[PDB]
Every structure is written in C-alpha cells, then in structure tokens.
From Swiss-Prot, chain A:
The keyword Ribosomal protein applies. It comes from the Archaea. The keyword Ribonucleoprotein applies. Belongs to the eukaryotic ribosomal protein eL32 family. This is Large ribosomal subunit protein eL32. GO terms for biological process: translation. One of its GO terms (molecular function) is structural constituent of ribosome. Keywords: Ribonucleoprotein, Ribosomal protein. PROSITE patterns: RIBOSOMAL_L32E. Part of the 50S ribosomal subunit. GO terms for cellular component: cytosolic large ribosomal subunit. It holds the Pfam family Ribosomal_L32e.
From Swiss-Prot, chain B:
The keyword Ribonucleoprotein applies. SUPFAM superfamilies: Ribosomal proteins L15p and L18e. Keywords: Ribonucleoprotein, Ribosomal protein. It comes from Pyrococcus furiosus (strain ATCC 43587 / DSM 3638 / JCM 8422 / Vc1). InterPro entries: Ribosomal_eL18, Ribosomal_eL18/eL18-A/B/_CS, Ribosomal_eL18_arc, Ribosomal_uL15/eL18, Ribosomal_uL15/eL18_sf. GO terms for biological process: translation. GO terms for cellular component: cytosolic large ribosomal subunit. This is Large ribosomal subunit protein eL18. Part of the 50S ribosomal subunit.
From Swiss-Prot, chain C:
Gene3D superfamilies: 3.30.70.330. This is Small ribosomal subunit protein eS24. The lineage of its organism: Archaea, Methanobacteriati, Methanobacteriota, Thermococci, Thermococcales. GO terms for biological process: translation. It comes from the Archaea.
Swiss-Prot record, chain D:
Residues 1-43 are annotated as: Disordered. One of its GO terms (biological process) is translation. This is Large ribosomal subunit protein uL15. It comes from Pyrococcus furiosus (strain ATCC 43587 / DSM 3638 / JCM 8422 / Vc1). One of its GO terms (molecular function) is structural constituent of ribosome. Residues 1-28 have a biased composition (Basic residues). Pfam families: Ribosomal_L27A (PF00828). Belongs to the universal ribosomal protein uL15 family. Binds to the 23S rRNA. GO terms for cellular component: cytosolic large ribosomal subunit. SUPFAM superfamilies: Ribosomal proteins L15p and L18e (SSF52080).
RNA sequence: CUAAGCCGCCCGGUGGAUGGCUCGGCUCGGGGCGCCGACGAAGGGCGUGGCAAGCUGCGAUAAGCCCCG
RNA sequence: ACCGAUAGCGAACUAGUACCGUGAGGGAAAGCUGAAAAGCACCCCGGGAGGGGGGUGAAAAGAGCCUGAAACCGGGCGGCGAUAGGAGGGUGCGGCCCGAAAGGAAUGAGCCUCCCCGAAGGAAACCGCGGCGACGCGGGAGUACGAGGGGAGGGGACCGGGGUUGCACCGUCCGUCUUGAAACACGGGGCAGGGAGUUCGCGGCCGUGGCGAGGUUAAGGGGGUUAAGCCCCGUAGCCGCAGGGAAACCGACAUGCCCGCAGCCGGGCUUAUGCCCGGUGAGGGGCGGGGUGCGAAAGCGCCCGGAGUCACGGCCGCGAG
RNA sequence: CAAACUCCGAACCCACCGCCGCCGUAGAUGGGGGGAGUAGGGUGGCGGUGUAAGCCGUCCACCGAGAGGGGAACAACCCAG
RNA sequence: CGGCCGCCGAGACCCCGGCGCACGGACCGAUUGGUCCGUGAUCGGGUAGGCGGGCGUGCCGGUGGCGUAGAAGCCGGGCC
C-alpha cells in the first residue's frame, strides 16, 4: 500500500534525521580517533558512557532500527542494485528497483549502460 | 550448544511435508513423527527386528522415526516404514514377508495414518 | 503480484522454464497451490501439466524468487521429473 | 557436517577470555599443584575431589598372575549360535552329515554359555558347557556332545 | 578592515606509512650426491685491475695461462 | 591453502659487513626514476649552494627520483577574538560562512491560507450555589485545543547536510587493583607500524554424517598421474557383543507381571480447534526372576530383556615454555 | 536481683494437612550432561564485644554489578528500576 | 506548631507510531534458515560468566565480473 509506504518513509526520515553519530568515547581528544571515526563499546569499570549518565554521548540500541517495510531503501524510496554491466542492468525491475553503476566501471561501458537504462526506462542513481 | 537439526535436505523436506500433511488431514501422527525425526542425531531412534517382532501384530503398519537394524529374529508380517534400513533388517523383513518402505510411501498408502504404530 | 523475469522453451527436452518473482510486502510466503493457480490462470497453462520447482525467500526482502516448469504432456514428466517432486506436487 | 569458529574469535575483545579477574590463570599456583599433585598422599588441596570422583587412587589391591600362564577361554552363547546359525552354515562351521544338524563350536569359542533360548534341535560340539546351557539344549531336544 | 591564540578547509614543507612489485627467505613427500689432508687439507694474512676503495674471483703466469669438446 | 622489506634466515644490498668489549664473545641500519637518460641545450641573477625563464618526457616521476598517509610546522581562506571559569563534551536552536556530483526538489523547497477526522489529555467568558478565606461544586463541555493521519488553493528555489561560534540547562578525562577513583593511588607528549588461548598426546562431553551386532583401519602394496592429488587392496591391531572376583574360578530375562506419556482406536460435549471418558500402549518407571563376590543361610554390592563404532568440527581437564 | 535461675510466658518462627491465590501440558516440581565465575565485600536494622571509633556474626533491603528525578554537592537516604 | 486550598515537578503511569526478544501457528528455502500472523499487566538496566547472530582482513577450490575511456592505495563530501 503506497499510503503506508509513504507514512513509513516519512517515519524513517524523521528517525534517521534525529539519530546521532555513534562515536567511541574521547573520539575528539586524540587525533588517532578523529582520522578514523568509529564506535566502540565502553567497557571500563568507571566509564561514564558505559554507566549511561546524562550529559554524555549515547550508545546504539536495537530500538533505533528503521521500520521493516522501508529498511535499506533509497531516500527516494526505490531499491538499490549494484550494476557492473548491461547483463545485470537488464535484470532489474523498473517499477521497484534502481541501478547504481559500480565505481570501477569505465566511461566506455558506462555510456552503454546509461543508454540501455534509458531505453529500458530504469532509474539510475549516478548517471555519469 | 545450539541444535542445528538434520543436515540432510531430503530429511528436512520430509519433515516439512509431514507437518503439511498433518495440517491437511487433521491428524497428529505426522507432526509427532516430524518432531521425533527432529530430535538430536546422537539421540535418534534405534529399533531392532527383535523389538518389532515382540510388540507388532501380523499385518500391522509400523513407523520408526530413525533407523531399523537387523538384530534378532522376525516372524510377523508387518509393513514397516523407516528413514534408513540396514541390509540385514530389510532382508529379514522381506524373508518374513513384510515390506520395507519409506515414510513417503507410508503417507501415500495411508494418508490418514490410522492404525500406524510408532516405534522408537 | 507475480512478475515473470524469464521464459525459456526447450522442445528438445519438451518443456518451458519460467523464472519469476513474487512481490508480497506485508504478506507471508504464498502457498504453492496459490502460486500455481495464479501462474496457470495468467499464462493459460494447463494446471495438470505444470510444476513449481521451487519458491525461495531471502531475508527481510518481500521479493521471493520462483522457478517453475510446464510440460507438453505427462509422458515427458514421467520420463524426467523425479518421483518425490511428482508426489510433492500431487499431480501423480 | 557442521563446522564452527573458535571461541577465541568471539572473545577477541573480551580482555579476559572468560578467566575472570586478571590475577587468575597464572600457573601451578593457579592449578593448586601441577599434574596429579595434591591427591592425598602429602598435599590435600584436591583431597575432597579425590575422595569422591577418584576413589582408591591411593593404595594397593591384590596381585596379578603372569600373562604367560593366563589361558584365554573364549565364550559363546546359545542365543548367538541360534541367531547366527546360517552364517555358520555358509562358513562351514555347521553342516548336516545325516538327518541331524551338526555345528562345531570348537573352532571358535571354548565354552558354551546358556543365555537366551533354543528353538530348533541342533547338535553343538564344544569343550565345556554350563549346566543351564546343557539343560536348555536337552529341553530343546538337541545333543550336547562333550568333546 | 583588532594584535596574540583556538578549531576547520586548501595549498606548501617534514617524514616515510599504505598500496603494487620481488634475482631473497621459510617449509616439504619423492629424487640426486655425500667426505677433504704430508702428492701438504680446511680457516686466515698479504698481494693482484690503465684509471680500482668494498664485495667476488685469482696467486709474482696473480677478475688470469694451456689442450680436447 | 607459508612471508612479502619493522614480515621472511641476523643478512633480498660492498652481512656475520660496519661497529661494541683486554678477553671469552655480542652484533646493526640499508630495496623501487622513466618505455627510452631522452638525466634539462641555451638566457638573467648569485661568491657559491642554488633561484627564475626556457627545453625533455603521456605524466617530473628531476636523480634529495613509483605512490607520498598521520604526527608536526608556515601562508591563505571561513568563524570566534583582550569583563570572563571549567575533563574541553551532550540536548535544542540562533548568528557568519560553504553548499555542481553523490540526498530530496520546477512532475514543486522552505513558506502563506483554508478544509476534514482525530488517541491519552483537556481550558475559559458567563449563569446559580457552598466556604470566614485561599477556593470549590453543577451547566457551558468532554466544547476550543490536542500527537498524528489526509485534502485543496497561492508563490516559485530552497531544504536536508557541513565548518566555526553564541545562548539556556546539564556534565569533575581514559585503563586498572579496590567495598570504595576526579582523586594528593598506579599506567597515560603526539603519530605510524608490530603485539599477546598456539601445536601434539590422552580423556569427558555435545552438533552432524556413514555403517550397524558389528565398526574401523595402521604400517605398507598395486594402478594412474607433471605431481605428494585420484582409484583399489591391506583384519595385524583397537573398541563393542558378559558380567562378578585379589585370585583360582564360575557364568545371566531374545519379556513372567504392574503403572504409564506421545501416538492409534471407540464414545460424549465442542461451529471448529479443543476438552473429557474407556481400551492398546513403542520409548519410560517399578516388581519378579537370573549370574558372580562375601557367607552356614538369609541378605546385600555390581551386572543381565542387543547399540556400538568411525569420521569432521566445537567446549573443557592434565602434561609439555 | 540473675547471659551461664524459672512456678509462668507472648509477639513470632518452623513442620505437616484442607482450601483461596499464583505457576504449569506453549511442559513446572524433578532428573542427566557441558561451561563457568565466585573463597577481601560495603551501607543500613538487630545481637555479643569495646570509653568510643572499631571488631565479630546475623537480616538480603540498597551500592558492588544500577540509568533517570531530589536531598548543595554525597555509593548506601527519598521517588524510581 | 494543628490544618487546609491551588499550582509546578521524572526515562515512573496512560496513549500513538517503530524495533527486537520469548513462546505458538501458517506458508516457504537442496547445511544452522526465511516472510507473515497471535500473546506478552504477568518481555527490554547490568560486572564476573554462559549462549545465539552479525561486521572486517590474507590466502586457497568454485562461480559471476571490473580495469590504461584508468585497478589497488591516499585526502575531502553524499547515501544506507
């Protein structure tokens, strides 16, 4: 149902706009963490983040997951499919799938893929 | 650790088919055999022609959720269905005049599974 | 919602192979009988001479993949298709 | 047919690998004596375990005769003979040699035990027979030739 | 149009990580070959190149001399 | 199915070389231009080193030479910037600035107006009455409003996101022993790279697969192969089929009976599911009987109505660093 | 007058039986197997001891191993998991 | 001090939408499973520790591919 589809897309948009960037404790303090930003669970005995005190960054929780019906979909609402040639370009569903040309595809093959996608009426996320 | 269950695709398909058959015909014997087959491999049912002769009557239908082995002696005329048969067990049943079939053939012959006796 | 992704014909073996996808968001995996009925109704196929080789569901996606075959006559099935598949279909 | 990864791969970030406080898992002191030490003779660290799960670990029992003089007496049962008569017939251990059916259990096994039941009248020939075996054979109607 | 100072982006310096490469290592079932010396051995010293210090090779015939293929 | 220049032998290279100690002896660092040197002819400045033009090359990759990260330093750019206090961050938004691509968007952005339904919750104007009083009670009214879910109209280029900074509130760093860490308790100048449940033997278990009263090979042999891959043989050996006992030695239910879960059969209620009742009941439990050891015997311990064995993977115990 | 007295004697605690309540055929009570960690505890009420702090037990409530809202900050106090 | 009347004030209590988990069910996978459905006032803090799933790196047997119209690597951004 497109109505529920749109409602859940808006719900996911709001939720992932409010979602924060989960980063390990003291990521800002040392360059070794700034150049390689990640999240690591705080395990220390006195870690304030582990103790989950107010005024400290938050930690990932299962509740933050987006609704099932629209999980992993493009913000436009389509479904991404990685494509490396025309053979697997042709195997998509234009009404429900979109093609993302792999970064390693040269321009010679990319122009062919783009013209074939135009012929088949399939949306392309990176048309160049 | 975790119970993975049978690695045999044929056995998994047979279990699923038994559950569906029990649903279709409104009987519980097939679901019972399904979970009995699902039990862990190190505890899988083991039966012998001696026990079958001891407890089965002539012309009866027997289902063994596991393996049937040829230890002992057999006189009865029994239709026995089991996942696996040892050559000795199958030969003994054939000589006694019984039938060594699979649960699939048992289902086909008796879809409602009335009168079938489970041996473990 | 069944969408056919490929149809192939092989008269040398005498059958038609059908690759399709069922789009069923918010619904369980459709039953084999329902899928067969829908496919036969849409393709005008003979219900008595068609088999659903498999239906597969992959993780959270609501796009299940189905493969089916349709034979010209029962002779080719009795010659090729295995007994367990025939029993599962229930057409024998 | 099932394969799994090692627990260390899951414990990579554990910082202890399931050994508790960092003081434990050091050596002989952590085990309370290397090997089978502490089982009761002088050190009683594992005396409580020894007196329950490994009784008679300390002490002595009777003697053992030299293996050279220890003769082996193979034993077979009437149940086994009756159940495997056909195989004996194939191997030649059993034949007819007249109306009666003879079986030579002298080639294998030296003593016949009386476990089970006897159905058909045979004649076994062995060296020694249990009283129960002889009684069962006579009741079944076979002959027990003492050869 | 604020002096020093702080964070971020770009460019430049300093450094030598990463990536790719490999005439070197390590391991190995099977196969081959296994002693040299008073007819002066192995290890070493010193010499030897047109320009030649190191390594390598050679010994006042000294990065070489002669014969068969 | 080993490593790929802090790895692999200590040595990928003028390596047991240079160097340290009287001595015995100890012992490093150090690889890469380009396809071809085509390795910058000439001009100006400079004492020189070198700098600026100009040439070579697909690309300076310019020999201080494949790529050129981080730490650190200098310049430009954007933000703050000399009356302001907290481990340098968290929530929310406001200034200044950026904003092609990958995110939405002219098939309509922020925005302005209007209409409908709305969970939990939920006023007041005014009317009458109670209370010394703060105030309360009935109607208004479960009304206006309400998270959110929809629709229509106007405009026509932003929104999301990002850097810095301001305001309000909150927040005394990281690892570790400890009852107790911000600690005047220990380890913590920065960055890059390396870094710590491995292998064998035995044993107890579980996940799965083969065979099954049997299971399984070991050393080794033949065939074939570029090859150690692949095929077949190999029953010696090991475990199980019979246990009890120090030993001599003796030597057992293939079901005699009772309870009974699942399943099966019959009946009643139940739309159906399901529930109840009565039989049969594999597996399960219990009697009875049996073997052996102690005994004069009774009686007790262990055992007896057939499931084990091999293999792959995992957890654990002991010994080896 | 009595911790090492009792002619008397509660609150209260324990065992068992019937029932209400709760849990249990979506499998409890119970049984078998694999893997542990734990052998310094603290605050609070009570009991013995000590001038007191404190020491030694007991009660299992809270911190240890526990967020959020308060007691100005506060381990232990109040609400709250 | 003996009382009383209003109002503020939590992640607690109620409601709306979402995620996962435990249990049961239907259907569906050629190796541990997948989609959906029903109940949860009687599921959702966590140290030692136990258990399940998932993410990342080198190499090997397969399978399907990209690249001088520019691979690996490296700096800054968008999305999931």
């Amino acid at each position: 149902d497109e109505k529920e589809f749109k409602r859940l897309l808006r719900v996911r948009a709001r939720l992932k706009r409010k979602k924060p960037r989960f980063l390990r404790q003291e990521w800002w303090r040392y360059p070794k963490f700034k150049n390689d930003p990640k999240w690591r669970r705080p395990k220390g005995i006195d870690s304030k983040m582990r103790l989950k005190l107010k005024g400290k960054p938050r930690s990932p929780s299962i509740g933050w997951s987006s609704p099932k019906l629209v999980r992993g979909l493009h913000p436009s609402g389509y479904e991404e499919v990685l494509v490396h040639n025309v053979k697997e370009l042709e195997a998509l569903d234009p009404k429900r799938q979109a093609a993302r040309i792999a970064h390693t595809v040269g321009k010679k093959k990319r122009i062919e893929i783009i013209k074939r996608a135009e012929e088949l009426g399939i949306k392309v996320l990176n048309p160049r | 650790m975790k119970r993975t269950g049978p690695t045999d695709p044929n056995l998994r398909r047979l279990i699923r088919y038994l559950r569906k058959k029990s649903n279709e015909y409104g009987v519980k014997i097939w679901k019972d055999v399904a979970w009995r087959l699902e039990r862990p491999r190190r505890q899988r049912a083991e039966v012998n022609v001696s026990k079958i002769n001891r407890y089965a009557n002539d012309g009866e239908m027997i289902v063994v959720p596991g393996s049937v082995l040829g230890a002992g002696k057999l006189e009865k005329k029994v239709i026995v269905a089991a996942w696996k048969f040892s050559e000795t067990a199958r030969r003994k049943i054939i000589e006694a005049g019984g039938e060594a079939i699979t649960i699939e053939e048992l289902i086909e012959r008796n879809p409602t599974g009335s009168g079938v006796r489970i041996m473990e | 919602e069944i969408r056919i992704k490929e149809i192939k014909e092989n008269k040398l073996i005498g059958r038609k192979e059908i690759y399709f996808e069922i789009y069923h968001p918010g619904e369980p995996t459709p039953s084999r009988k329902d899928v067969k009925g829908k496919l036969v109704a849409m393709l005008d196929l003979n219900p008595e001479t068609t088999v659903i080789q498999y239906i597969r569901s992959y993780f959270g996606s609501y796009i299940s993949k189905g493969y089916a075959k349709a034979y010209d006559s029962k002779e080719r099935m009795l010659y090729i298709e295995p007994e367990y598949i025939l029993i599962r279909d229930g057409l024998i | 047919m099932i394969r799994r990864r090692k627990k260390v791969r899951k414990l990579r970030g554990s910082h202890t690998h399931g050994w508790g406080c960092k003081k434990k898992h050091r050596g002989g002191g952590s085990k309370g004596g290397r090997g089978m030490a502490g089982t009761g003779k002088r050190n009683k660290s594992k005396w409580t375990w020894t007196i329950k799960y490994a009784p008679d670990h300390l002490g002595k029992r009777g003697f053992s005769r030299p293996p050279e003089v220890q003769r082996e007496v193979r034993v077979v049962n009437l149940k086994f003979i009756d159940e495997h008569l056909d195989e004996l017939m194939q191997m030649g251990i059993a034949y007819e040699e007249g109306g009666k059916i003879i079986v030579d259990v002298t080639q294998f096994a030296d003593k016949v035990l009386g476990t089970g039941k006897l159905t058909r009248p045979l004649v076994i020939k062995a060296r020694a027979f249990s009283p129960k075996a002889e009684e069962k054979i006579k009741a079944a109607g076979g002959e027990a030739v003492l050869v």
